[PDB]
Ligand binder design. Structure first.
Ligand code: 6NT
Length: 299
């Protein structure tokens, strides 16, 4: 049974998965995505290292493949993070002039978003912008541009594609008493009051065993920032306990503004932490107990 169809029947938008070209041509990933998932996200092909490895010169082959595949198969598409610090090409991190870096950041956002204008439901515009204590992470963008880089990024994105839902995303937002969770709420509320077009908060949910229960309190707290949408992104759970996965799904169901959930791959051996077997399909592409528990919970 399709968890995407079942979550749509409960009033949500999608159950999604991260993938890319070489996943779609190997294993059983294409067949499982066709049957069971409603949105695809690029595992790597839209990050800055993959798309603009030298200035103004864009690499679109991998991203184009994914977008085409999704359109041919009737799937929604999420757009990978436009502005973050992870694996940034060195040409970006060596810029020290505020005007130049602002122009570079705007060009990167506008070029990607324009290419797929109208085809992408939601873009992760800024990612991983917070330290664990809730202060802003001192990346090249913060150091050179200042804290206005976040408003500028969102305003530029809204102009490039008004159809898309624009998200800020971060990890370790899984507990309502952790400082980072309240800090992103505080800042998103302030940005929205200033008219910054942040449509969503995306929670990059990488859980250890037993941490699913806390999402039932953290996700409503994230929703108190007043964004139109929230989502659960990049989900994986060490051990893949049914209890943990069902708790995350029910957090989504309980929060009216939570539009959907995306899991961080199809089958355990293709996870970035495969030794924790944290996904919904095993190494033979069989649905694991957590998959069936989600099916029953949604019924
Ligand atoms: O939800 N996702 O699995 C996901 C995967 C890669 C991404 N890059 N940016 N946002 C992302 C979300």
């Amino acid at each position: 049974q399709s968890i995407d169809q079942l979550i749509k029947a409960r009033g949500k938008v999608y159950f999604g998965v991260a993938t890319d070209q070489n996943r779609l041509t190997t294993g059983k990933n294409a067949a499982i995505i066709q049957a069971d998932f409603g949105m695809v996200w690029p595992e790597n092909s839209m990050h800055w290292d993959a798309t603009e490895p030298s200035q103004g010169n864009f690499n679109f082959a991998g991203a184009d493949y994914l977008v085409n595949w999704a359109q041919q198969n009737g799937k929604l598409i999420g757009g990978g993070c436009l502005v973050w610090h992870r694996d940034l090409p060195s040409w970006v991190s060596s810029i020290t002039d505020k005007n130049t870096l602002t122009n570079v950041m705007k060009n990167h956002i506008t070029t990607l978003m324009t290419r797929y204008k109208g085809k992408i439901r939601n873009w992760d515009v800024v990612g991983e912008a917070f330290n664990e204590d809730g202060s802003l992470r001192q990346t090249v963008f913060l150091n050179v541009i200042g804290e206005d880089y976040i408003p500028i990024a969102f305003q530029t994105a809204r102009a490039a594609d008004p159809n898309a839902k624009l998200y800020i995303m971060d990890y370790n937002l899984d507990s309502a008493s952790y400082p980072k969770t309240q800090a992103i709420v505080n800042r998103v509320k302030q940005w929205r009051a200033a008219g910054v077009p942040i449509d969503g908060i995306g929670s990059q949910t990488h859980l250890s065993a037993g941490q699913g229960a806390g999402v039932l309190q953290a996700l409503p707290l994230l929703a108190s920032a007043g964004t139109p949408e929230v989502s659960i992104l990049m989900l994986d759970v060490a051990g893949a306990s049914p209890t943990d996965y069902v708790n995350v799904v029910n957090a989504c169901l309980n929060v009216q503004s939570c539009v959907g959930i995306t899991v961080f791959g199809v089958a355990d051996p293709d996870s970035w932490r495969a030794s924790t077997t944290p996904l919904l399909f095993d190494g033979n592409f069989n649905p694991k107990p957590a998959y069936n528990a989600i099916v029953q919970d949604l019924q």
